[PDB]
Design goal:
monomer; alpha+beta; Transferase(Phosphotransferase), domain 1; 5-stranded antiparallel beta sheet; 33% helix; globular; membrane protein; bacterial conjugation; horizontal gene transfer; pIP501; type IV secretion system
């Protein structure tokens, strides 16, 4: 059980009753809208309090019972992880949220029951991924199934994949749209469900 993990300029602390995301205020030029993250959103845990501590912002989130950091499940079998990806695609949080699609930012209760932790405001105060949605999905899937970190795929996905020789990830890389990604994942999941 990993209790601490860096995601870009965020530090995540996975505690007993809460998650804490810490961001040094030196990374936050504008802060007028930081408290906007208290707004509830389906599939996101609730913010309990927003504090600062010696120049660092602390966002404290409720941690509901029975939710495990997805980081802790990276060594589960591919057929288990495929089910998770299929469910994440159904949740479709990137369409209406400024967030990070990353293992650090996702909690799992079961393969069909997942929650996100951190999201940003809509006034560019807090950081998030501005990448094309399909790119975020490809990089996330590579980080969840592959040998390298999210940041390695974000920098040059095709270069890393050419030598990685992961046939599933090569198929993920080739899709042209979000709908085709959903079809690929669903088809692979259907194959795992039969024998």
């Amino acid at each position: 059980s990993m209790k601490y993990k860096i995601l870009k300029n965020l530090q995540f602390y996975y505690q007993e009753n809460v998650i804490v995301v810490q961001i040094n205020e030196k990374y936050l030029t504008n802060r007028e809208h930081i408290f906007d993250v208290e707004e509830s959103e389906q599939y996101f845990v609730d913010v309990e309090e927003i504090l600062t501590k010696d120049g660092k912002l602390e966002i404290v989130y409720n941690r509901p019972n029975g939710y495990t950091p997805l980081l802790d499940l990276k060594e589960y079998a591919d057929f288990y992880k495929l089910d998770i990806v299929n469910r994440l695609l159904e949740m479709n949080v990137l369409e209406k949220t400024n967030t990070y699609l990353a293992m650090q930012n996702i909690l799992l209760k079961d393969t069909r029951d997942l929650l996100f932790i951190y999201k940003a405001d809509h006034f560019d105060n807090l950081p998030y991924s501005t990448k094309e949605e399909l790119e975020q999905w490809k990089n996330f899937i590579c980080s969840f199934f592959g040998k390298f970190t999210l940041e390695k795929y974000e920098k040059n996905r095709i270069e890393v994949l050419t030598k990685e020789k992961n046939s599933f990830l090569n198929d993920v890389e080739a899709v042209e749209s979000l709908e085709s990604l959903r079809d690929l994942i669903k088809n692979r999941l259907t194959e795992e469900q039969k024998n």
